[PDB]
Design a protein around this ligand. Structure first.
Ligand SMILES: O=c1[nH]cnc2ccc(F)cc12
Ligand SMILES: O=c1[nH]cnc2ccc(F)cc12
Ligand SMILES: [Mg+2]
Ligand SMILES: [Mg+2]
Ligand SMILES: [Mg+2]
Ligand SMILES: [Mg+2]
Lengths: 194, 194
């Protein structure tokens, strides 16, 4: 029984905007909230995709393919699933395969696509689809993968074994100032907890 | 070999601000990024998110989640119990406190992540992911008393760990809720550990 009453623009950049949200609380009292949105969302069912890329190779343990890059908002390097915004008219699956090839060089196969899931719902309306993709690392096309990074894109690939992901992430965090993404960490914790 | 040169305040609310970050790209070219930050960090991270593993003998292990209206999303979200870390509170103490306020359950700390980023292309927001076990057979967890702060209105949803991804997909399809990306990532890895 809660709902939005109004959304007032506070400040609008090229990429991000701040809004004052008025909503009805369950007691029937009007309250406000400071909300972040992207300016880039048209008809996409989500802002972006994140890819869970499972690298599969005969007589190898499965690896989870990750990317390391400088994130200006963090003032530092972050370890994340490959990810990007969905272009206008692009499907989440095409966006996922495209961003995975651009960021890692690998050509994946779709396994499954989540519904739109929320990035930080107390702060922002941002959403992604989480797209699971398998990579046949025995295919010649996946032998010597070269990232195809766009303008102002500078991405390092880190493939870690699924069977040891949390400890391998911990070893990278111990050896440097970097930040692991919360989704990557959540995924690694569940692999341990299973 | 990338770094921050300057941060320009664009707009400062009570809770959130928008900044224009100037940074050095790895080619030696100066570039700008629109960044979001919270105004409330004075802590290891902005917040905590709790993975609450409800353990009851002769029952399936459950993950305890919360459903709340999220003004930025304009709708109801399913999330790990979570909130901001109080000035001079430890992440572990914030985790047990928020779990009790949001669910009424009294838990034990199992493990605590390093600070992990929420949406590092958008914001500098970080949390600690705190794994907590709940002895659902203890008298203190018989009839759990959730203590909502002013303007919090939280429903508790306990789902079985070994079916988590299927149960969340079902809630999305029937209830038109948005699942949190960390919750979804956790659920995926429980299935992928196979
Ligand atoms: O208006 C808000 N925006 C973002 N985070 C918030 C956290 C607490 C609060 F009461 C209000 C807000
Ligand atoms: O300045 C940005 N802020 C947030 N997201 C962005 C996504 C792509 C881009 F080129 C620029 C931005
Ligand atoms: Mg990207
Ligand atoms: Mg990209
Ligand atoms: Mg909360
Ligand atoms: Mg509180």
């Amino acid at each position: 029984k809660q709902y939005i009453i109004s959304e007032e623009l506070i400040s609008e950049g090229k990429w991000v905007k701040l809004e004052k949200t008025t909503y009805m609380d369950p007691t029937g009292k009007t309250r406000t909230w400071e909300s972040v949105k992207r300016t880039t969302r048209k008809e996409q069912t989500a802002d972006g995709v994140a890819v869970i890329p499972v690298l599969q190779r005969t007589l190898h343990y499965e690896c989870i393919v990750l990317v390391k890059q400088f994130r200006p908002p963090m003032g530092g390097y972050c370890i994340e699933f490959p990810a990007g915004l969905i272009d206008d008219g692009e499907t989440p699956e095409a966006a996922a395969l495209r961003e995975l090839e651009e960021e890692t060089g690998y050509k994946g196969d779709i396994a499954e696509c989540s519904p739109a899931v929320c990035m930080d719902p107390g702060l922002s309306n941002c959403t992604i689809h989480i797209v699971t993709v398998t990579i046949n690392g025995d295919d010649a096309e996946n032998a010597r993968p070269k990232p195809k990074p766009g303008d102002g894109e500078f991405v390092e690939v880190i493939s870690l074994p699924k069977n040891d992901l949390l400890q391998r992430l911990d070893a990278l965090v111990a050896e440097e100032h970097l930040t692991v993404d919360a989704r990557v960490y959540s995924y690694a914790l569940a692999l341990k907890h299973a």
